[PDB]
Structures are given as C-alpha cells and as structure tokens.
Design a protein around this ligand. Sequence first.
Ligand SMILES: [Cl-]
Ligand SMILES: [Cl-]
Ligand SMILES: [Cl-]
Ligand SMILES: [K+]
Ligand SMILES: [Mg+2]
Ligand SMILES: [Mg+2]
Ligand SMILES: [Mg+2]
Ligand SMILES: [Mg+2]
Ligand SMILES: [Mg+2]
Ligand SMILES: [Mg+2]
Ligand SMILES: [Mg+2]
Ligand SMILES: [Mg+2]
Ligand SMILES: [Mg+2]
Ligand SMILES: [Mg+2]
Ligand SMILES: [Mg+2]
Ligand SMILES: [Mg+2]
Ligand SMILES: [Mg+2]
Ligand SMILES: [Mg+2]
Ligand SMILES: [Mg+2]
Ligand SMILES: [Mg+2]
Ligand SMILES: [Mg+2]
Ligand SMILES: [Mg+2]
Ligand SMILES: [Mg+2]
Ligand SMILES: [Mg+2]
Ligand SMILES: [Mg+2]
Ligand SMILES: [Mg+2]
Ligand SMILES: [Mg+2]
Ligand SMILES: [Mg+2]
Ligand SMILES: [Mg+2]
Ligand SMILES: [Mg+2]
Ligand SMILES: [Mg+2]
Ligand SMILES: [Mg+2]
Ligand SMILES: [Mg+2]
Ligand SMILES: [Mg+2]
Ligand SMILES: [Mg+2]
Ligand SMILES: [Mg+2]
Ligand SMILES: [Mg+2]
Ligand code: NA
Ligand code: NA
Ligand code: NA
Ligand code: NA
Ligand code: NA
Ligand code: NA
Ligand code: NA
Ligand code: NA
Ligand code: NA
Ligand code: NA
Ligand code: NA
Ligand code: NA
Ligand code: NA
Ligand code: NA
Ligand code: NA
Ligand SMILES: [Sr+2]
Ligand SMILES: [Sr+2]
Ligand SMILES: [Sr+2]
Ligand SMILES: [Sr+2]
Ligand SMILES: [Sr+2]
Ligand SMILES: [Sr+2]
Ligand SMILES: [Sr+2]
Ligand SMILES: [Sr+2]
Ligand SMILES: [Sr+2]
Ligand SMILES: [Sr+2]
Ligand SMILES: [Sr+2]
Ligand SMILES: [Sr+2]
Ligand SMILES: [Sr+2]
Ligand SMILES: [Sr+2]
Ligand SMILES: [Sr+2]
Ligand SMILES: [Sr+2]
Ligand SMILES: [Sr+2]
Ligand SMILES: [Sr+2]
Ligand SMILES: [Sr+2]
Ligand SMILES: [Sr+2]
Ligand SMILES: [Sr+2]
Ligand SMILES: [Sr+2]
Ligand SMILES: [Sr+2]
Ligand SMILES: [Sr+2]
Ligand SMILES: [Sr+2]
Ligand SMILES: [Sr+2]
Ligand SMILES: [Sr+2]
Ligand SMILES: [Sr+2]
Ligand SMILES: [Sr+2]
Ligand SMILES: [Sr+2]
Ligand SMILES: [Sr+2]
Ligand SMILES: [Sr+2]
Ligand SMILES: [Sr+2]
Ligand SMILES: [Sr+2]
Ligand SMILES: [Sr+2]
Ligand SMILES: [Sr+2]
Ligand SMILES: [Sr+2]
Ligand SMILES: [Sr+2]
Ligand SMILES: [Sr+2]
Ligand SMILES: [Sr+2]
Ligand SMILES: [Sr+2]
Ligand SMILES: [Sr+2]
Ligand SMILES: [Sr+2]
Ligand SMILES: [Sr+2]
Ligand SMILES: [Sr+2]
Ligand SMILES: [Sr+2]
Ligand SMILES: [Sr+2]
Ligand SMILES: [Sr+2]
Lengths: 237, 73, 56
Amino acid sequence: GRRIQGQRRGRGTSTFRAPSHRYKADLEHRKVEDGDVIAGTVVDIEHDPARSAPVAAVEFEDGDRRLILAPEGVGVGDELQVGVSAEIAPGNTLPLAEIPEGVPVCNVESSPGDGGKFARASGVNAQLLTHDRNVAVVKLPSGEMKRLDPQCRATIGVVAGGGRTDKPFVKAGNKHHKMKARGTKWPNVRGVAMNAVDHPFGGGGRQHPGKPKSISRNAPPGRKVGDIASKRTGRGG
Amino acid sequence: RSGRFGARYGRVSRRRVAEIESEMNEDHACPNCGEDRVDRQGTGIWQCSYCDYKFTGGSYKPETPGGKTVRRS
Amino acid sequence: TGAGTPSQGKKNTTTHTKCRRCGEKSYHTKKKVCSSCGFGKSAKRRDYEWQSKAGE
RNA sequence: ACGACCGUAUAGUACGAGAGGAACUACGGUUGGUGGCCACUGGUGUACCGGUUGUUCGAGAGAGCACGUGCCGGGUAGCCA
RNA sequence: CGAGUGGCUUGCUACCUCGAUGUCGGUUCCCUCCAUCCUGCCCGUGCAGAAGCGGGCAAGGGUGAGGUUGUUCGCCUAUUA
RNA sequence: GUCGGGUGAGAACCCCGACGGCCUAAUGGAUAAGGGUUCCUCAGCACUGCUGAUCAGCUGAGGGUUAGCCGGUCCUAAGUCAUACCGCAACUCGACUAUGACGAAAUGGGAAACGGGUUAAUAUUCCCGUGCCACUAUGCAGUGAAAGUUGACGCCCUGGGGUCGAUCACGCUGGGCAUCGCCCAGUCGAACCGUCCAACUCCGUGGAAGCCGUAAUGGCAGGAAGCGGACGAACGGCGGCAUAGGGAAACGUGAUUCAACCUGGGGCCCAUGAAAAGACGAGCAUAGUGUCCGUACCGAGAACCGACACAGGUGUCCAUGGCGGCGAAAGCCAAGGCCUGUCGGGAGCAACCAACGUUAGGGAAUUCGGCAAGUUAGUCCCGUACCUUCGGAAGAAGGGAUGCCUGCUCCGGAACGGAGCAGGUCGCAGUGACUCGGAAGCUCGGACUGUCUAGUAACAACAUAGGUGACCGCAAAUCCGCAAGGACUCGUACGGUCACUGAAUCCUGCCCAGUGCAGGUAUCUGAACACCUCGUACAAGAGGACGAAGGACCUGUCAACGGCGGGGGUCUUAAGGUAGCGUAGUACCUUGCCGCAUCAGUAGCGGCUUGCAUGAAUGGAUUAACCAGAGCUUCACUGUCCCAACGUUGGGCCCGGUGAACUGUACAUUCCAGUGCGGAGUCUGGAGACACCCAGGGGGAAGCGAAGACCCUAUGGAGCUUUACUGCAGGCUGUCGCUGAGGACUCUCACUCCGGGAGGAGGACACCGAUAGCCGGGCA
RNA sequence: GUGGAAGUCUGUUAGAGUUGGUGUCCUACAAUACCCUCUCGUGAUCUAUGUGUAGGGGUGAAAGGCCCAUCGAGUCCGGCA
Ligand SMILES: [Cl-]
Ligand SMILES: [Cl-]
Ligand SMILES: [Cl-]
Ligand SMILES: [K+]
Ligand SMILES: [Mg+2]
Ligand SMILES: [Mg+2]
Ligand SMILES: [Mg+2]
Ligand SMILES: [Mg+2]
Ligand SMILES: [Mg+2]
Ligand SMILES: [Mg+2]
Ligand SMILES: [Mg+2]
Ligand SMILES: [Mg+2]
Ligand SMILES: [Mg+2]
Ligand SMILES: [Mg+2]
Ligand SMILES: [Mg+2]
Ligand SMILES: [Mg+2]
Ligand SMILES: [Mg+2]
Ligand SMILES: [Mg+2]
Ligand SMILES: [Mg+2]
Ligand SMILES: [Mg+2]
Ligand SMILES: [Mg+2]
Ligand SMILES: [Mg+2]
Ligand SMILES: [Mg+2]
Ligand SMILES: [Mg+2]
Ligand SMILES: [Mg+2]
Ligand SMILES: [Mg+2]
Ligand SMILES: [Mg+2]
Ligand SMILES: [Mg+2]
Ligand SMILES: [Mg+2]
Ligand SMILES: [Mg+2]
Ligand SMILES: [Mg+2]
Ligand SMILES: [Mg+2]
Ligand SMILES: [Mg+2]
Ligand SMILES: [Mg+2]
Ligand SMILES: [Mg+2]
Ligand SMILES: [Mg+2]
Ligand SMILES: [Mg+2]
Ligand code: NA
Ligand code: NA
Ligand code: NA
Ligand code: NA
Ligand code: NA
Ligand code: NA
Ligand code: NA
Ligand code: NA
Ligand code: NA
Ligand code: NA
Ligand code: NA
Ligand code: NA
Ligand code: NA
Ligand code: NA
Ligand code: NA
Ligand SMILES: [Sr+2]
Ligand SMILES: [Sr+2]
Ligand SMILES: [Sr+2]
Ligand SMILES: [Sr+2]
Ligand SMILES: [Sr+2]
Ligand SMILES: [Sr+2]
Ligand SMILES: [Sr+2]
Ligand SMILES: [Sr+2]
Ligand SMILES: [Sr+2]
Ligand SMILES: [Sr+2]
Ligand SMILES: [Sr+2]
Ligand SMILES: [Sr+2]
Ligand SMILES: [Sr+2]
Ligand SMILES: [Sr+2]
Ligand SMILES: [Sr+2]
Ligand SMILES: [Sr+2]
Ligand SMILES: [Sr+2]
Ligand SMILES: [Sr+2]
Ligand SMILES: [Sr+2]
Ligand SMILES: [Sr+2]
Ligand SMILES: [Sr+2]
Ligand SMILES: [Sr+2]
Ligand SMILES: [Sr+2]
Ligand SMILES: [Sr+2]
Ligand SMILES: [Sr+2]
Ligand SMILES: [Sr+2]
Ligand SMILES: [Sr+2]
Ligand SMILES: [Sr+2]
Ligand SMILES: [Sr+2]
Ligand SMILES: [Sr+2]
Ligand SMILES: [Sr+2]
Ligand SMILES: [Sr+2]
Ligand SMILES: [Sr+2]
Ligand SMILES: [Sr+2]
Ligand SMILES: [Sr+2]
Ligand SMILES: [Sr+2]
Ligand SMILES: [Sr+2]
Ligand SMILES: [Sr+2]
Ligand SMILES: [Sr+2]
Ligand SMILES: [Sr+2]
Ligand SMILES: [Sr+2]
Ligand SMILES: [Sr+2]
Ligand SMILES: [Sr+2]
Ligand SMILES: [Sr+2]
Ligand SMILES: [Sr+2]
Ligand SMILES: [Sr+2]
Ligand SMILES: [Sr+2]
Ligand SMILES: [Sr+2]
C-alpha cells in the first residue's frame, strides 16, 4: 500500500511542523549561581501562542528581561524570586526541598536544572506531598506519584489559564484557528473512510475495520493503528 | 449571549457559552484595589480599568477553584 | 478548471535559464542547479552511461 | 377519398299476456379522414398609428438607445385554423 | 387420446459476427399479415320481439383519451361501432 | 456601417470629412510577470493576414531607451546554498551544530524631486525653473552621545480633523441653441520652506457626596466640571515658492457631502496578528562627490501561455465622471478608445436549423418527472399558522398602496437628506422600461457553514463541533532515517499521539465461547552461547541439564473484531434481540392488508406488521433550523400538451474571392424473391432502368470513427486482500563483545544522562555491534 | 431606546463556483469552449508572488483525488532488439 498519515508525520515536512518561527520563548527557569539573591519584577502579561495560556515578562535585578511560565494570580508590578532562599509565595521558584509539603506547584523540573518539564499546561499543577533528604514525592496532574530529586526546582501555585477546556469549540472554524497554532494536521479523516491502499481499516463495501482494533505493542509502524496495546476497551466491566 | 449563534449548534453548546461568557463579563473585584472593574484582555489575561492592575487568572474567570487553593496551604 | 488549455495560461514563471557553465538553457534559476551539466550541484560535469546505448 | 355513428319520420307500430320493442325506406346532423379557400370568426402581423417609463440631444418640437419592437394598446395586406 | 400448422413466448444448438451490426420501454413515420375486435353480407339457436350465444364469407376503413408503474404486460376509469 | 473625397497601375475593408453606431471595472489610463525590438521613420507587397490591400505586429533599410533623489543596488521573511564537523563502501548523497553568504524589481522594510517645456521615437532621466538627501572637505558652533523613540504591524464597529472629486449659490471668461432662457466648458498654479493644531498624555488651579461626558462604552475625593498650562497631526489650512509655470480669455468666492491622508473611542481571541538594516535622539555655512545595472514597446477577442493574429487562461491600481437608484446593480450618457470580438454581394429572402417575439379556447390532458417556458417580483402599510433547541419558523400565508401637478407640515445645522398632509389631474397599465421571491403541505437523508471525483458523479459521500475508547510522566507515547541524526517540541496529561461515532434531546440491553489486546501464571512446553556425558589423541555429531520472551493454562476487556439462531414447555457456538423503529434508500413474497386522495393512484402519506434478512457510538430513536440532495400533494400560471400558426435576427439558397478534412480493393442505375459461412448493389431467376445536374430529409451500404469495453482463453500484466506459499523490515526476549572492583548483593573506573561550571543522577546496566527464539500483509 | 454580534440573510460589488437545460458546439473559438438558469460571497473565505514536501515517495476535509493535456504508482533515457 502507501504509507499511512502517521508515517508521513515523521518526515517533519511543513504540513506537520509547529509554527516555531511564530513562537515566543521556552519558559525555562533562570539559572542562579546560588544565594537566591535573584529577584525581578513583572513588567507585563502576554499571550503564549504555543500554549493558549498567559505568560509573564519579568525584569530581573541583574538586568535580564525574560518571559516566565506564569501561575494564576501574577500581575504587573508584583515581585518574584528565584533561589533557595526565595520566599514561599505564588509565582516564586525554588528547589522542592525548600517547598513546604502540601503546596501546589507547577513547571517542575525532571532533573535538577533542566528548566522545568512537568505541569506546564493551562490551569494544571503538581502536588508536592512527601519530603526527605533523598527523594521528594510529587503528585503530577495525571494522578501519578512521581519520585523526584529534592534538588528539582519548581514554581509555587497552579498554572494560569485554568478552565480553558470547559468551553466547547462549538464550531469547526474555532478548532481550525487553534490547530493553526500547533504542530498538527487537521481535520481528521477516519481510517475506515479511506481506500484499502491508504490504511489498515480502508476498503470494504460498507465502512468498518475488517479486523480487531486492539493492536500489539510490537506491531511495526504502518500497522500500529487503532487501539494501541489497550489493557481493555469500552466502558463496561 | 449565544443569540449570535441563531438556531445553530444546539442547546448545551450555546447554553455553556452563555453561562461561561456571562460569568466572564461580570464585574470582577480587583485583587489590587477592591473595585469591580476587572475585564478580560485576552485568554487568561485580566485588567482593572480603575487602577490598571494587569494580571493572570483563569481562561474565562479571573479566579479558578484550584487557583484559590494555593492561597490556603 | 481543465488541466489542459485553460491551465496553460497561468504559466509565466521563469525556471530554466541559460547556464553560465555549459551554455544550455538548463540552469534552474530557483534551484540554482543546471539540469544539463550539473553546475551548482557538482564540480564534476554531469554525465551518465545511459545517455547512450549500452554497447556504445 | 371516403369510413363510422347519433337523431327524426317509419312507430310506441310489427312481435309479445305484459314488460319490453324492431326493419325496409326517406330525411337532418356529428365524428375521423381527405382536398381546397380567407367573404365570416379567430391568431399573427419587429408595415403602420397611439400611449408611456429611464436616459441623451438645453426646454419645446422632433428624435436615438434600453436586442434585434424599452414596455403597453389597436391592427391593413398577406399567411393561417 | 390421437394428427397437425405457425414461428408471437420460452428452451436448445453454437452456423454467421468479438480489427464492435449500440440495450428495454416509449416516441415519430411508413408498409404488411389474418388466427376478425368494430363496420358489410350470411347460417344456426335452448331464434316471439329487443337482445344474447355460437358459426361462415370478408383485411376497404376503423380500433381512440386517461390514473399507478421505466415498464412490456397488466390492474383500474370514463367514453366508444 | 453609409455618402462624398484623398492616394494609387489597382481601393468594400489604407487615409480625410460628414452622417450612423459600439465600449464605461472596460473595448478607457498606468503597470507586474512573461515576450524581446514587436517601438519610430522611410521604401515596399513575393511571404504572413479567414476575402482585397496602396495597409500592418509582414519584407528591406536606417533610427530610438540619457537618472544622486523611479526601480535595482542595502535589510531581513518562510527558506536555500557554501565551508567546517559527522555519517556513508563512496559521492554530485544525508540530518544536526557553528560560520558565512543567498533569499522581496507590481505587492514586506527603505535617505532625497517637483512643476513645466521639448522629440518621429526617451523623459521625476534631456532642457528651464525651483527644491531636497547622503557622504566628504573647510569653517563657526558643540561636548553632549545613549537612554529612549522610531522602523513595527490582527480582525470587527465607530467619532473627530480633512484634500481631491462631485454638487449647490453668485460673479467673471468662452462656446452652443434660438418662440422660451436655457445648456456646456473654463475660472489654474507643485515639490519644498515657514507657520497653525485637533486627538491622546500629563501638570497647575478648582473642590463636585451626584454631577461631567459620548454615536456607544464610560469618568470622578486615589480629585468630576470649570479655568490656565506643557507636550503634541495631516499627502490638511494658511504665507512664501510665483512680474515660476500654464491659459485664447477670465485667470473666482462661499458652501455641503467628503476617497486620500491625519488622529482618537469601543469590541473580539482555547486564534495574539514578522524581522532586520536604517532613522530619530544629535546645529549651521560654503565646496566637492554621488559611480554601477534597468529604462523602447505590448500587457492582450493580434505583442504573454495555450502548435495560431485561439470566444480559453493570466496579478495589480485607477472603487468618487453625469442621470439613475439602496448601490461599485440595470439602463442611458461623458472624458477616452473603437467601427479589427475583420470577407463581401444578391433573392419579402422557400424547406430546414440556431436564438427569440406573439398566440383564441381548454390549462399539465404533455412527460419517468412541469424537463423547458412561464407565474411572482422593487418599496410602504395592515396582517401572519403548525412547529421550535425560544434563536427561529417569517418576506410564512393573505390584503391594500404606489404616477404627475399645486401649495405645505414634521425631523435635522443642512443636503442637490428623510417621513408625511391637502387639493388638482392623466393612462389599459405609475417598482409603467430597467431592476425585481411564485406560494403552501407531507415524507426520506445528512444536524448546521464547510469538502469532493481539473475533464460525464456536488450527493445521502468526506469534514465538523459534540460523545467515547486507547497509549504515554517527557531519557515518555507516536512517527522519519542505513547512519550521522530528525518531526511532534520555544510542546508536558486543561498535553498530544492512535482510533471509532458524528450538533442538541431521550437513550445506548445481553454475550469474553472463537479471534484481537492486556495481565498473571504452580506445573507443562520453549533457541542459542556457557556447562555436563558419550563420540573423536582433536573436530564433525548424538544426548543431558538449565530455560527468556512466546505458547499451553487462568483472568480482565465489546463505545475490541464481531454475535444476539433452530427446536421444545434445551441444542450449536458465549449469549438468544431488551428501549425503540418497522413492508424501511433494509420486506423476496409485494401492486401485502385497512384508510386517505383521484373519474381511475404498482406512486405518496397514515395505521397494521409474524422484521425473506430492523435494532442500539457496526450507534437506536427523534428532531427545530439549514439544503442547486430523493419522493409525493395543492393553489397560482403557462404553447408541455390538444394543434399548430404568424412574425424577428443569424444561417441556409444564388454571385465574387478564399479554400480544407473525413473517406476510397474493384466494379457499381437498381427492385422483388431465392441462393450462399444461415443478415447480397455484384451469385440465380425475374422485374425495372435514356444521360447528366440542383435542393432535401437521412431507409440501406450489417455507413464512417476506435485491432469489443461485455464473455472466455493465455502455465499474460498490474493494483488490492488474507489464518495462500515463501521471504524481508520492525518490535519483544535470551546470549556474547563493550565490561571494571569487592541465585541473591555492594561498589566505581568505563559508558549514559542532567548541569554554564563545580558537581549531581545512573552504572557495568542502558545505548551500540553480533547472534538465537517469538510475533511479524508494515513490505517484497 | 441604544448597541452592532454572526463559519447570519439578500446581493452577476469585487471575487469564487457550477444545479439544470441532458440547450449551443462536438474535423470546435476551445484536446473541457459558449449562453441562460443556478450557488458562495467577513470567512474552515478568496487571491498574487516567494518558499517547502518527489515517485512505492509526496500531497489528499478521502474522490484512488492530485504531483505540468497521462496516475490503482509521474516523466526521461537506459536495461532493450
Ligand atoms: Cl485541541
Ligand atoms: Cl523599474
Ligand atoms: Cl469617540
Ligand atoms: K461480436
Ligand atoms: Mg519553556
Ligand atoms: Mg497549519
Ligand atoms: Mg473524521
Ligand atoms: Mg471511498
Ligand atoms: Mg493495507
Ligand atoms: Mg457511519
Ligand atoms: Mg461458432
Ligand atoms: Mg454502425
Ligand atoms: Mg378467415
Ligand atoms: Mg335476434
Ligand atoms: Mg389494408
Ligand atoms: Mg512613452
Ligand atoms: Mg481576432
Ligand atoms: Mg393560448
Ligand atoms: Mg400520457
Ligand atoms: Mg424548471
Ligand atoms: Mg427643523
Ligand atoms: Mg421513500
Ligand atoms: Mg450537509
Ligand atoms: Mg467530473
Ligand atoms: Mg452542491
Ligand atoms: Mg470527536
Ligand atoms: Mg475527542
Ligand atoms: Mg457521515
Ligand atoms: Mg407504504
Ligand atoms: Mg452495545
Ligand atoms: Mg460503521
Ligand atoms: Mg482486440
Ligand atoms: Mg471485466
Ligand atoms: Mg498479477
Ligand atoms: Mg545532551
Ligand atoms: Mg503482496
Ligand atoms: Mg503559492
Ligand atoms: Na378489414
Ligand atoms: Na397505464
Ligand atoms: Na503645511
Ligand atoms: Na451616483
Ligand atoms: Na478586413
Ligand atoms: Na454560508
Ligand atoms: Na469472546
Ligand atoms: Na445487528
Ligand atoms: Na448545504
Ligand atoms: Na411558442
Ligand atoms: Na441514408
Ligand atoms: Na491494476
Ligand atoms: Na437590546
Ligand atoms: Na451547470
Ligand atoms: Na513509481
Ligand atoms: Sr525545554
Ligand atoms: Sr535548556
Ligand atoms: Sr474496511
Ligand atoms: Sr456495557
Ligand atoms: Sr476556462
Ligand atoms: Sr503564474
Ligand atoms: Sr549544491
Ligand atoms: Sr558520469
Ligand atoms: Sr328510431
Ligand atoms: Sr312501455
Ligand atoms: Sr432597438
Ligand atoms: Sr414588467
Ligand atoms: Sr466488422
Ligand atoms: Sr383468409
Ligand atoms: Sr359484425
Ligand atoms: Sr419485448
Ligand atoms: Sr407487471
Ligand atoms: Sr500585386
Ligand atoms: Sr507600429
Ligand atoms: Sr540580498
Ligand atoms: Sr517596495
Ligand atoms: Sr484586511
Ligand atoms: Sr467626517
Ligand atoms: Sr515607458
Ligand atoms: Sr490595460
Ligand atoms: Sr482576455
Ligand atoms: Sr466619447
Ligand atoms: Sr482583413
Ligand atoms: Sr402585436
Ligand atoms: Sr402532470
Ligand atoms: Sr399525467
Ligand atoms: Sr403582496
Ligand atoms: Sr474542485
Ligand atoms: Sr458537476
Ligand atoms: Sr447525538
Ligand atoms: Sr477474549
Ligand atoms: Sr422486540
Ligand atoms: Sr440520526
Ligand atoms: Sr442479375
Ligand atoms: Sr443535408
Ligand atoms: Sr455568510
Ligand atoms: Sr449571497
Ligand atoms: Sr445532466
Ligand atoms: Sr433555454
Ligand atoms: Sr464537449
Ligand atoms: Sr457588509
Ligand atoms: Sr496531469
Ligand atoms: Sr528499450
């Protein structure tokens, strides 16, 4: 047959690329020598094209102007801190070790100094649970208990823009506009609606996959479609 | 409200749009001062026409349930 | 719109031009590569054994 | 190049208890087909005459254009049913 | 039960045609056949009449309009000799 | 087009005049691409030109494009290339990372030029007048100099300022018309220099507890109005420019509406609307320099692409010329262009055809089907059902009005803006042309806008929001590459990948036996290396022990593939069809039966329904709105029909000129029968038949056009499928090498990852090389 | 009353498209044209130029559509007689 859409994606051609030349910045935490003697002031709030959420421009003492992953409740004029001794307040960044248990945080680093990997989407947040000298236990947005190096930095509070998902797109045109700001091919043609040559589910007088949808983890690309290695399907049981 | 949607989309879709936008455009109490002059400027961006305080909040509400949690703990 | 005559009217783009190296009107001014002599692609001159009968 | 039918007189007669109910023949008409003709009726009639909208020729008069008449009314010859 | 005629139905065969002879129904227009539906002329009757029913000669002329359905066929309606 | 005339050997079509017409977002003006001399002049007509030709985009010969300030050139955009580094057997191949360069001629950013005159052909380029920019030099001034500002930005609504244009009023100059007194044109004048400043922002004063303000939102004791002030606009006003220029002349003045341009206010985003060079910041005089490339012409019913002087295709701006009207609509008319959407002459001009006008009475009878045609129509007033997601349905439906003239009222600052009143009055007809909906009901489908088979399918198909399931914590899931590497990703579960269903509403039953996926697993089975035995002086080889994934086996799972029958009052093979719907776009039987409607209804609708063979996200039911989607009915209307007629324009016919193609074994004036490979102009028998030509509609030549697409055959081809055969990628898993120290363990030193770094995390694992088992239409 | 939303309505505004005529044409004006009717026309809109994706590969709101009059695997030359 012909390569399926999922395979065309990988070549990274324009149709599948994100409009990076239009993106603003990668909200990674600032790098501090130590001391925590680094503070800045929120100079403005902006829209982040890549995440459909707001971001805050901060001017730091040492003259560095950078965009930051803003939690809810950060406004212009406010002063933020980044360091071990940073004050424990919304919008401030410091290593999990310094963060008091039971405090919601976002933009959590995976490995100390990486800049932040977890809980960055609209209105989300990780929940710092257990402390220790060897491991900090955080509960990520998906509900998974994650063991992290207490040296991993994080921002106090939940991410701005919460509830974005509560409003329906209502029309195709709205979906359209959002999709144009992401690395995605949209709209979506169902596999069952294509010719046999174009997809494992194509072909047949009437539409229907001529096979079970749960595909094995070991299936090669081109064949791994439908419900990948599902542990189960449906709503029952 | 969803009246601009005419007889399209159906109840639910345009019922939520109405409510969400109804609460979205209400006068909101500014965290800076105390006046009900906060208006949305864009997605998750709010500002007070009185004192000019520009800040981040929910997408359609200036404060979200989870956002109000942080304060506590 | 037919793929024939009506679609031929839209053709006013310049692609292949006289090549600096070989003189043939084969220098693709958008790719900056000569489809005839290889100029812009290779220092060596474009050549292939299939340009003639195998035993000749 | 003519085919067929209806109706009237025959006759409420013949026949028949009655009910019902013919024919020969002489008439008038209709229908289908056929050939021709325009006095009559009807159609057409971008000959013609009139009314009138927009615009241009300054107005008036008189005209052009609005598709092979802008639109509307009447209609001779001729051709037609 | 027996003997036939036709070549309108269907089946059979594979003779002609695969370097192509374009389908069904309808329409339009022309010619024909008779195994006659009407019209002409007859014979019989379980033929009074009127009318039926059956039969004979006869192909001059006629055999129309509509409802469903692509339908052919057919079912249905009002007319009709 | 026509009448005159000009030139010429020759004139329907070359030129002049008159008369008559055509084009108005174009048939006019300027241009991009592309073409390339097609541009201008002279001389020509063999060639090219739908006829002719004295003409020309043709032929011969000459000539023509002038720049500091118009483009290029400079900047950077998506993105491209080169070099280095790395991969590759290798390269002209290949991703990343550095560096460098390249990448915008109408239409991104950008130092500076206007007006007039001149040529056969150039012209913000030459010439005249005036002006401006950059750099450099000299001089005076200046110590400031880099912070900031600009370049620099989306979509929708709107106020204010304001030029051109257009129009109104009055004057002046010139023209036209001649029953009046009207009608037309002109009434000019730049860049630049100088000056003015509304809006926004801010300051002083002031002191509002209800006032201020808008088209609207709004503003205020955190200080409203009012008053004063700072900063501050136009491609605009004003003055100079200008006894410049231009005009035969006059060489105006005010106003309204106001494109350009300037400046504000509001609203929207699950969408956020470039960058860089440069400029400003940062004075003035005088002088010098400002090179290089482009510059003609066409820009299209003859200069481009389409083989053509092709009815096609092909970007930008002129979007403000007059009447009209809501209008960038129609129709008519200017400026400007044209008679080249380039063969003519003749016949009341026949048949026939294209496109069209008018048809009495009947009115869909026509037809598969109102196909085609028609009906309605603009604006105002009255009035408007079922149903509904309360938006809508709706312009439902239905009814009435509509011109002109005279004099007025109201709104507004006013319009050459709008809404009305009274009286008078004409026509068959007042949206008089033009422009300009026919309406209503029932059913099926898809919710909707949207998409599609360039070139026979626009739909019920695809998409969609909405619903749902699956995978994945990021050193991830999914995907591309042989590799070096890469997309997703300036992304992180409110994410994004993989699938299914397809708005809302009410709902979504039973089945895990088979197949798929996943989890588990005592025991069973399960490869290679190492290990043990036999064998071999060794090796081949035979056997053993251990046993990973996988399978057996167990479990979970159907919004996973799919399934929901036959029999009896269970059987196969798990269950045995629940809500609903039902003769369906699914019902063979079938024109099912009852009813409605019709004169008559295989149709349509309602009901029944045992459903050959409906049924729940293989979604069921239902549904307002929507629809060039399928079917049915009604009102209105009509040449669709009864049944055809007359007319109009272009052909057709005759004449001048020009001038192809298809097709052709031969013969050929045929007709009726027969015969023949059974479908003969040609054979046989008869019949008929004097030759030639014109027009016609097409019966025959099994007419012409295409080595039948249907069907079969070939140990033909290709695309597609799968539990066909055989293999190959890929994933999982064991083993060996990388690989180190002390059947479970610690460590650090290779190696990996994070970190700017120190250092941290991990760690002999993982990655990678090799091999073995399993899966493996992803691929051959 | 104001306000002016909308994948909102009418609309040959520009611009885009193409339901029916199974009209015209069918050695064409044209190897996809012409006319009338019809649909869209503030947005998932239309449009110019530049730029990127390449052949078992692209691209595809999916029609096996499209990738220079050709696509159920482009074109050219070669393998090849
Ligand atoms: Cl999304
Ligand atoms: Cl230029
Ligand atoms: Cl305003
Ligand atoms: K055949
Ligand atoms: Mg970031
Ligand atoms: Mg995109
Ligand atoms: Mg889909
Ligand atoms: Mg399909
Ligand atoms: Mg497949
Ligand atoms: Mg479906
Ligand atoms: Mg045979
Ligand atoms: Mg034939
Ligand atoms: Mg007989
Ligand atoms: Mg009798
Ligand atoms: Mg006869
Ligand atoms: Mg010129
Ligand atoms: Mg021509
Ligand atoms: Mg009539
Ligand atoms: Mg009939
Ligand atoms: Mg019609
Ligand atoms: Mg007034
Ligand atoms: Mg139906
Ligand atoms: Mg639809
Ligand atoms: Mg097509
Ligand atoms: Mg359509
Ligand atoms: Mg969905
Ligand atoms: Mg979803
Ligand atoms: Mg669908
Ligand atoms: Mg029925
Ligand atoms: Mg189910
Ligand atoms: Mg399905
Ligand atoms: Mg053949
Ligand atoms: Mg076949
Ligand atoms: Mg094959
Ligand atoms: Mg790294
Ligand atoms: Mg295969
Ligand atoms: Mg493009
Ligand atoms: Na007879
Ligand atoms: Na019938
Ligand atoms: Na000025
Ligand atoms: Na006007
Ligand atoms: Na001519
Ligand atoms: Na629409
Ligand atoms: Na099962
Ligand atoms: Na079923
Ligand atoms: Na539609
Ligand atoms: Na007619
Ligand atoms: Na013939
Ligand atoms: Na094939
Ligand atoms: Na209101
Ligand atoms: Na059409
Ligand atoms: Na190929
Ligand atoms: Sr990052
Ligand atoms: Sr980083
Ligand atoms: Sr299928
Ligand atoms: Sr269930
Ligand atoms: Sr065309
Ligand atoms: Sr082009
Ligand atoms: Sr190159
Ligand atoms: Sr070579
Ligand atoms: Sr009688
Ligand atoms: Sr009697
Ligand atoms: Sr006329
Ligand atoms: Sr009319
Ligand atoms: Sr033949
Ligand atoms: Sr006989
Ligand atoms: Sr008889
Ligand atoms: Sr038959
Ligand atoms: Sr039948
Ligand atoms: Sr001559
Ligand atoms: Sr010329
Ligand atoms: Sr450049
Ligand atoms: Sr430019
Ligand atoms: Sr715009
Ligand atoms: Sr104004
Ligand atoms: Sr020029
Ligand atoms: Sr032009
Ligand atoms: Sr054209
Ligand atoms: Sr003129
Ligand atoms: Sr000519
Ligand atoms: Sr008349
Ligand atoms: Sr009918
Ligand atoms: Sr009928
Ligand atoms: Sr009315
Ligand atoms: Sr299309
Ligand atoms: Sr079509
Ligand atoms: Sr639904
Ligand atoms: Sr199972
Ligand atoms: Sr049931
Ligand atoms: Sr449905
Ligand atoms: Sr003979
Ligand atoms: Sr003929
Ligand atoms: Sr619309
Ligand atoms: Sr429209
Ligand atoms: Sr058709
Ligand atoms: Sr027509
Ligand atoms: Sr054709
Ligand atoms: Sr509009
Ligand atoms: Sr093609
Ligand atoms: Sr060959």
